[PDB]
Amino acid sequence: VSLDPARTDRPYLLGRLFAVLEKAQEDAVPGANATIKDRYLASASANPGQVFHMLLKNASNHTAKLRKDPERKAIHYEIMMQEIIDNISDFPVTMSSDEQGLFMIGYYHQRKALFTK
Template sequence: AIIKAYYLRKTTNEQFKEVLQMDINEESDYLPYVLGRMFSIYEQIQLAAIPGINTTIKDKYFTSASTTPARIFPILGDLAAKHMRKTWQSKGLKIKLDKTLGALTKKVGDRYPSRLSLEERGAFQLGYYFENQKRFEKTNKNTEDAEQGENND
């Protein structure tokens, strides 16, 4: 909230303002925001392919990915491809993450930016955290729905 309030007052970048919402903006084509969302999907792919992993790509690549995406995202793409080839417990999750990654990759286009400014890094972080929050909200909603179903039986 503090990051969003600061940037709303300071920025004149209209694309950046469109991602300063209270929830994920899935329609946004603002590249740093899309890259943050992609990073979250890459992490989710890793977590699903290697349950119980201690060190995720966030621990190793988050700062570099938000600063120099052109150097890091090809590495992350290769890792994600390896993770997608593994056997997953949930085929549905694998398909969902693959589709989401495909849609986000389409928004990126044919090349990653070599560097992101401080303001763009803020958008990257927002994209990452909103995409993660979306995952947790759906998990909580599914748990609540299951509990309500049990109470109605």
């Protein structure tokens, strides 16, 4: 496929993490008018180290809301998050323009994969 789970580039991994968090929020809370990409994309790409922690808090809450129901995907997203943050030593304080482009590329690559039936 197009997604490369072996890239291990910090912008790419952050984009993938953002995509999986958005998918988790979308699953946990259907019908919401705005998704994570609509709200925190600007802040996330501006200073990831300042907002990714709260994004992860919200993702944890969303996964908690999903694990209770007997249909348990929640665990799958949690393992994805373990793997993605495994390769990050620390969040970047700022991301360069090309790094932001790679961030968006990784986000879109991860998002399509999670849409597979």
